[PDB]
Amino acid sequence: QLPQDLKGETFSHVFGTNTSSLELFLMNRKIKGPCWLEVKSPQLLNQPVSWCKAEAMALKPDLVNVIKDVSPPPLVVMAFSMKTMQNAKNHQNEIIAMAALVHHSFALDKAAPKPPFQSHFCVV
């Protein structure tokens, strides 16, 4: 990466030296917020790179286009609470209990479901 204040005999200033990849990808394809996206010509990775259930590869940014005429899907909501205890010996904050509530279908574009949780688990 070239220096921010690069100067030369023929050019007076340089713009975009330290720019970030995510901003260029977002503005070049005109992606405004979470929405449905179309990706063409997918490639298959040699090895998995994520814990997600499905994976794909896009070779070039121009291979991904934004489609807005599709309804949004519901997400999964997970709330959790923790309890801690200071170590008697020295300066440590140990964890003794977790309690979580989960809902498998929470609609972003609708009202909050009642009850807002379906299953739960605890550990001590």
């Binding site: 200071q86 300066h91 440590q92 904050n93």
Partner: protein, 74 residues
Amino acid sequence: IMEGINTTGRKLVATKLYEGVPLPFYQPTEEDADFEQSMVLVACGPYTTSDSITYDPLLDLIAVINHDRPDVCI
């Protein structure tokens, strides 16, 4: 500057105290080392007793200064 443990954000359990660093000494010039030996007398007040106004210790100091003829008196 302290080095300690602050897990709750309301109290610091200090563990190490950094020692301070003094300013650099005055760097002598070649002309400053050419000077000769000198004597400086130093005295501080009060120059009179707690019940008198005659200033006898001041006169004694003047006599000592005259006798010893120092280079500087503060």
